[PDB]
Amino acid sequence: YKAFSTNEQDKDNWNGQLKLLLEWNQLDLASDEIFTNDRRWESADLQEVMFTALIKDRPKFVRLFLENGLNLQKFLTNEVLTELFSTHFSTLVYRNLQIAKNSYNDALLTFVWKLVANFRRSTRHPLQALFIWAILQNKKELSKVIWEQTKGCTLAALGASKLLKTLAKVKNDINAAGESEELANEYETRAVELFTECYSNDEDLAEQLLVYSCEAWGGSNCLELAVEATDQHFIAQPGVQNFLSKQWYGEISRDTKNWKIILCLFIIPLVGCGLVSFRKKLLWYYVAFFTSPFVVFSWNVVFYIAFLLLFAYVLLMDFHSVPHTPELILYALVFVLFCDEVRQWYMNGVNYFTDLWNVMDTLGLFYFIAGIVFRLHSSNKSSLYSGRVIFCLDYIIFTLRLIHIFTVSRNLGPKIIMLQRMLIDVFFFLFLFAVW
Amino acid sequence: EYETRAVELFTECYSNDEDLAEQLLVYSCEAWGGSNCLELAVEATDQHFIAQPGVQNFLSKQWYGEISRDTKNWKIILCLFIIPLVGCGLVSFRKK
Amino acid sequence: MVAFGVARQGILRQNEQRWRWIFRSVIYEPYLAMFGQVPSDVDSTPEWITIPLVCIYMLSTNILLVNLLVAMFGYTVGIVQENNDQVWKFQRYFLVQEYCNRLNIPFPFVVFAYFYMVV
Amino acid sequence: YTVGIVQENNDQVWKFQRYFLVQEYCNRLNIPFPFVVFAYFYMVVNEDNETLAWEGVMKENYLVKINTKANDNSEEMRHRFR
Amino acid sequence: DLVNFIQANF
Amino acid sequence: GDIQGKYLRLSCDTDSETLYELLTQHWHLKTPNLVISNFALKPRMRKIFSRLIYIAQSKGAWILTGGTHYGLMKYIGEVVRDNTISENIVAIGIAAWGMVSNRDTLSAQYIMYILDNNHTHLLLVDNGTVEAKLRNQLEKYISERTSQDSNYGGKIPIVCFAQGGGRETLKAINTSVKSKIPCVVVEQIADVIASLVTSSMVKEKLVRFLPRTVSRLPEEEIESWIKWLKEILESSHLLTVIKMEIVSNAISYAL
Ligand SMILES: CCCCCCCC(=O)OC[C@H](COP(=O)(O)O[C@@H]1[C@H](O)[C@H](O)[C@@H](OP(=O)(O)O)[C@H](OP(=O)(O)O)[C@H]1O)OC(=O)CCCCCCC
Ligand SMILES: CCCCCCCCCP(=O)(C(C)C)C(C)C
Ligand SMILES: [Ca+2]
């Protein structure tokens, strides 16, 4: 640099000095010597230098350029982005992405794959595309620098964590997968801390941001990405739990005692004339009470208990070759349950079936309908016998289902999860037992 | 102390490169003790060394063989039970 | 247990229309199973289709029982793990106070003292 | 084995699972089953910038907080000595 | 109002 | 015309009392505090002014600037907008109407010298720098105002802020210091004043800090600059320099 500065022709050519410093990665020298108020710094003049710094993995120079009056939004043209995705995108990483897409497909990885294909063969959120490009190549500092400029910072962090986790589950190369996994954990921690601070500063705005859906970063919000990535740490934070509790109680006051709500539920008239203590006219109070999710869930469990009792009554004490009214009523009730189940299946069918309890409840319906079909045939005695036995099995499975309610209770919820894990292990243990 | 040194050195060696590390690990010297690194590690019950991600990856590659490491298991099971399906689809070999 | 009992009631006989035999039959299954010589063994003995499913679900009931029996101990271990040398010290205060604030007289002679308390 | 499995905490997994339970009712129509079928029949037949600016401000504050940790090092004392 | 005040100012 | 906060065109020969009455009667309240201020956006300069604007918001202080989209004032306006997005801050830009690249008569609309739209209020001088005299007169008059509610004894406090160089900066500093009440704070020229706090030292510092500005300036201009700097330093008990919660500390110490 000293030799080139004193050449009688390079003194005026500051661009050459900047190019050489970028090539040799001299940050402090460039900041102190060339970056000064002597001359203005236009974005167009610095565009080529910024591109070169991006190519050659120069994060600190990128940060310096961004600080010194560089508009990154205007720089990321479509032609530049497609050229960068096509030429400087390593073929090894593209092969790894193909492997992940073919084997470990996801609702998100398909989106980034389509975006990459579009930019490679030939946008709304250039910053998001650049951040994805930096992430896929496990560039840490550059990814952080690009993230600092993004709008959906926490959403971008969650998406990057999910993408890195699904990329690391591949096994073509261990080192890259481990690097991606550690980077994903780092970004998850960053998002958790940032949202914790965000909720501490304010409450309503944090909830609005959390529930807010962007201009199709990945077609999902922060909560959906967090749950899809199984980011238990992020969604277990006090702010998110408070938001969930507010949604669960609804218009009802969060701090009112539970037994008061139970008494109001059983006793309708007491609701509008006392201890309900709503958070927010009399008809408004009543409608708000009856629209609360918690009251709905309590009434639904009551109705389900009544349904099971009626099921026992009609499957045990009242049965004949000819139909009886309780049986027809039970048919309507089970049809209502089936309609609700199919409504559930209508949304995210694959992911809905991925759920554990979903498997059990979905399985129950087929057995019930088979038994109901078999019962109708009264001419054959054996068919009636088999149908009644199948109804008994149906009762067993429904009573097994009834246990799901305890999840709502703070003091009782973990026990059910422990039971599920114990089932998973004891299955194999008793398998060996039965073998020997 | 020497076990820790060897573990760290081979971890760095595998991080820098993969194929050469495996060749060195399986390589037999000019009769240092008539054995390779893996044989000595197992004989000494050096559970820490042989439990490292690089060694486990090498063992998994040996176990799966020419089959792709990342293909789903149920695909392999179906190909096993159904012979014709093997050559005309989802096997997805790593390497006529 | 009630679920499996009603299922057993259904398997045994199709229908029953008396509010006495049904309740006794249902209540018999728990004690029958627990005390070891459950009539269920006698109860077990197109049949080719019905029998295997019943046997499989009986095995399911047994494995569920084992699952609960082990999960109980699993949670007890977690609960007993935490220290109690601090909670007991806290509880000791109530025991000490109960006697310290009360009149220091045994019950066989407390009533007489209680009388003097009244006046 | 059960002891080993139950040893690990579940106060975090339960919180994660609670989200599905909350969503199931939040997204669904808020009507009990005994009257849901009727409702089911009737079923058959810009602003972002305001929140995003505050998000950016909080991000800047968080970056300041995370960067301030470097001040705890003796580098500042060494610079004063220099 | 405002226009008249501004005009009077200048 | 109302740019789309408020934008007015006041001639140079205007009464400061009239402007204050217009701004106070139906636009703004009494001011507990008032501060007046391609560029190097170093982290130190990026944080000092953020702290300054936060302090102004906390105290409800007026901020006076040139009001152009080119320079640090654009950064100040952007920070003001961001904080407002996050009890309102008051920012007034002052410039020459003729100096504006485009002029529209009106509620007219201005769409992109170029003036920033972030600043809430803007004033244009009809002379043909021509606004320095008006700003100095307004600052002196405000310092002449009495506000019992203000903690500052009697008069409303006023602080001058210096971050960059140029003949305009020295002229403004000299004009402000000529008034006893105003006090100056120093963040090229800033380094010169920091180093100085007779002719040889000032000349050496000026040459070191601004190699090109001194070269371009004639000898008479350099002598005038030295005279201004000597006059400013003679009243050093008012002027304060920041060492390269510090902004609040420095402002409080100066006041
Ligand atoms: C009746 C058949 C059998 C019913 C058995 C079914 C039992 C069942 O389903 O849950 C019982 C539940 C227990 O209440 P539970 O103490 O667990 O509720 C938690 C408790 O209030 C905590 O205090 C809260 O947090 P924290 O610890 O203070 O920090 C937490 O909310 P949050 O503060 O964290 O946001 C609360 O969730 O009480 C009911 O009434 C629910 C409606 C039951 C419907 C009953 C309808 C008759
Ligand atoms: C043949 C239809 C079987 C439907 C199985 C679905 C069971 C769900 C019952 P629930 O979800 C109630 C709130 C609807 C239980 C948790 C109280
Ligand atoms: Ca479900």
In A, minimum Cα distance to B72 occurs at: A103
Residue E8 host element (H or E):
helix E2-9
Q: How many Cβ atoms from other residues are within 10 Å of residue A159's Cβ?
A: 28
Contact A178 B92 (CB under 8 A): no
Residue C70 to residue C73: CA distance in whole angstroms? 5
Token pair for residue C66?
Answer: 């084992």
Contacts 24+ apart (CB under 8 A), D38-45: D40/A336, D40/A339, D40/A343
CA distance A171 to chain B (A): 6
Angle between helices B19-26 and B53-64 (to 10 degrees): 80
Could you tell me which residues are beta bridge partners of residue A224?
Answer: none
State how far the alpha carbon of A260 is from the alpha carbons of A252, A265, A267, A269, F178, in Å: 12, 9, 10, 13, 74
Chain A, 8 to 67: residues with Cβ < 8 Å from chain D are none
Output DSSP code: residue B16. Answer: H
In A, minimum Cα distance to C64 occurs at: A423
Q: Using CA of residue A7, residue A63, residue A135, residue B7, what is the dihedral sign?
A: positive
Q: How many Cβ atoms from other residues are within 10 Å of residue B75's Cβ?
A: 17
DSSP letters spanning F182-241: -EEEE--HHHHHHHH--HHHHHHHHHHH-HHHHHHS-HHHHHHHHHHHHHHHHTTTT-EE
Sheet holding F240-241, edge to edge: F6-11, F121-126, F90-96, F62-65, F34-36, F158-162, F183-186, F240-241
Tell me which residue has its CA closest to atom 4 in ligand 2.
A337
Q: Do chains D and C touch (3 or more CB pairs under 8 A)?
A: yes
Q: Which chain A residues are within 8 Å of D52, Cβ to Cβ? A: 151-152, 209
Q: Which atom of ligand 1 is nearest to the CA of A258?
A: 40
Method of elucidation = cryo-EM
Contact F38 A38 (CB under 8 A): no
Contact E10 F22 (CB under 8 A): no
Residue A284 to residue D26: CA distance in whole angstroms? 20
Residue A195 to residue A204: CA distance in whole angstroms? 13
Instruction: Tally the residues of chain E.
Output: 10
In E, minimum Cα distance to F9 occurs at: E10
Interface check for A391 against chain C (CB to CB < 8 A): the answer is: yes
Token pair for residue A295?
Answer: 């009251």
Decide: A217 and A155 in contact? Cβ < 8 Å. yes
Q: Which chain A residues are within 8 Å of B72, Cβ to Cβ? A: 103
Give the residue from F129, F159, F132 showing the smallest Cα distance to F143. F159
Give the helix ranges, DSSP H, for F91-166: 132-144
Residue A335 to residue B7: CA distance in whole angstroms? 63
Residue F148 to residue F30: CA distance in whole angstroms? 11
What are the phi and psi torsion angles at F186 (to 5°)? -115, 130
Residue C113 host element (H or E):
helix C110-118
* Per-state percent for chain B, helix, strand, coil, to nearest 5: 60, 0, 40
Tell me which residue has its CA closest to atom 13 in ligand 2.
A300
Residue C87 to residue C91: CA distance in whole angstroms? 6
Best of A259, A294, A301, A406 to mutate for ligand 1, by most ligand atoms within 8 A of CB? Answer: A301
Residue A324 to residue A155: CA distance in whole angstroms? 57
Residue F6 host element (H or E):
strand F6-11
Best of A408, A412, A415, A416 to mutate for ligand 1, by most ligand atoms within 8 A of CB? Answer: A408
Decide: F11 and E10 in contact? Cβ < 8 Å. yes
In A, minimum Cα distance to D53 occurs at: A151
Contact A174 B54 (CB under 8 A): yes
The response to whether A344 counts as a known ligand-binding position is: yes
Token pair for residue C26?
Answer: 């249902």
CB–CB contacts below 8 A, A to C? 70
Q: Which atom of ligand 1 is nearest to the CA of A245?
A: 35
Output DSSP code: residue D11. Answer: T
Chain B, 11 to 30: residues with Cβ < 8 Å from chain A are 14-15, 18
CA distance B70 to chain A (A): 6
Q: A188 CB less than 6 Å from ligand 2?
A: no
Resolution to one decimal, Å: 3.4
State how far the alpha carbon of E4 is from the alpha carbons of E8, F23, F47, F124, in Å: 6, 15, 43, 19
Residue A116 to residue A120: CA distance in whole angstroms? 6
Contact C54 A386 (CB under 8 A): no
Residue F125 to residue F121: CA distance in whole angstroms? 14
Question: CA-based Rg of chain D, rounded to a whole angstrom?
Answer: 26
Report how far ligand 1's centroid is from the alpha carbon of A410 (Å).
7
| Nearest ligand to the CA atom of A399 | 2
Residue type, F29: L
Output DSSP code: residue B51. Answer: T
Q: Do chains E and F touch (3 or more CB pairs under 8 A)?
A: yes
Residue C15 to residue A312: CA distance in whole angstroms? 11
Q: Do chains D and A touch (3 or more CB pairs under 8 A)?
A: yes
Token pair for residue F87?
Answer: 């009890």
Give the residue from C46, C58, C53 showing the smallest Cα distance to A384. C46
Output DSSP code: residue F146. Answer: B
State how far the alpha carbon of A217 is from the alpha carbons of A107, A128, A153, in Å: 12, 7, 11
Q: Which atom of ligand 2 is nearest to the CA of A401?
A: 7
Residue B16 C-alpha from the chain's centroid: 16
| Nearest ligand to the CA atom of A243 | 1
CA distance A99 to chain B (A): 8
Decide: A336 and A306 in contact? Cβ < 8 Å. no
Angle between helices A381-401 and A356-376 (to 10 degrees): 160
Q: Which residues in chain D are followed by a discontinuity, with C-to-N distance exceeding 2.5 angstroms?
A: 45
Q: What is the 3-state secondary structure (H, E, C) of C20-84?
A: CHHHHHHHHHHHHHHHCCCCHHHHHCCHHHHHHHHHHHHHHHHHHHHHHHHHHHHHHHHHHHCCC
The response to whether A71 counts as a known ligand-binding position is: no
Residue A320 to residue A378: CA distance in whole angstroms? 9
Give the residue from F82, F85, F69 showing the smallest Cα distance to F117. F69
Tell me which residue has its CA closest to atom 44 in ligand 1.
A298
Decide: F166 and F51 in contact? Cβ < 8 Å. no
Longest Cα–Cα distance in chain E: 15
Contact A293 D22 (CB under 8 A): yes
Could you tell me which residues are beta bridge partners of residue F7?
Answer: F122
State how far the alpha carbon of F98 is from the alpha carbons of D30, F10, F70, F128, F137, in Å: 65, 12, 17, 6, 21
Token pair for residue C112?
Answer: 């007489």
Residue type, B91: V
Residue F148 C-alpha from the chain's centroid: 25
Longest Cα–Cα distance in chain A: 111
Contact C77 D5 (CB under 8 A): no
Q: What is the 3-state secondary structure (H, E, C) of chain A?
A: CHHHHCCCCCCCCHHHHHHHHHHHCCHHHHHHHCCCCCCCCCHHHHHHHHHHHHHCCCHHHHHHHHHCCCCHHHHCCHHHHHHHHHHCCCHHHHHHHHHHHHHCCCCCHHHHHHHHHHHHHCCCCHHHHHHHHHHHCCCHHHHHHHHHCCCCHHHHHHHHHHHHHHHHCCCCCHHHHHHHHHHHHHHHHHHHHHHHHHHHHCCHHHHHHHHCCCCCCCCCCHHHHHHHCCCHHHHCCHHHHHHHHHHHHCCCCCCCCHHHHHHHHHCCHHHHCCCCCCCCCHHHHHHHHHCCHHHHHHHHHHHHHHHHHHHHHHHHCCCCCCCCHHHHHHHHHHHHHHHHHHHHHHCCHHHHHHCHHHHHHHHHHHHHHHHHHHHHCCCCHHHHHHHHHHHHHHHHHHHHHHHHHHHHCCCCHHHHHHHHHHHHHHHHHHHHHHHC
Decide: A384 and A378 in contact? Cβ < 8 Å. yes
In F, minimum Cα distance to A36 occurs at: F40
Decide: F179 and F139 in contact? Cβ < 8 Å. yes
Give the residue from F23, F66, F69, F79 showing the smallest Cα distance to F161. F66
Q: Three-state SS for F125? A: strand
CA distance A405 to chain C (A): 17
Decide: B21 and B14 in contact? Cβ < 8 Å. yes
Tokens 């179906």 -> residue: B78
Instruction: Tally the residues of chain A.
Output: 436
Q: How many Cβ atoms from other residues are within 10 Å of residue B4's Cβ?
A: 10
Pairing outcome for strands F62-65 and F90-96? parallel
Residue B31 to residue A111: CA distance in whole angstroms? 55
Contact F82 D57 (CB under 8 A): yes
Chain A, 64 to 103: residues with Cβ < 8 Å from chain B are 99, 102-103
Residue F170 to residue F177: CA distance in whole angstroms? 10
Q: A337 CB less than 6 Å from ligand 2?
A: yes
Tell me which residue has its CA closest to atom 45 in ligand 1.
A298
Decide: D16 and A420 in contact? Cβ < 8 Å. no
Q: How many Cβ atoms from other residues are within 10 Å of residue C116's Cβ?
A: 8
Q: How many Cβ atoms from other residues are within 10 Å of residue B50's Cβ?
A: 17
Find the residues whose C-beta lies inside 6 A of ligand 1: A 245, 258, 262, 298, 301-302, 305, 405-406, 408-411
Could you tell me which residues are beta bridge partners of residue F123?
Answer: F8, F94
Residue type, C44: S
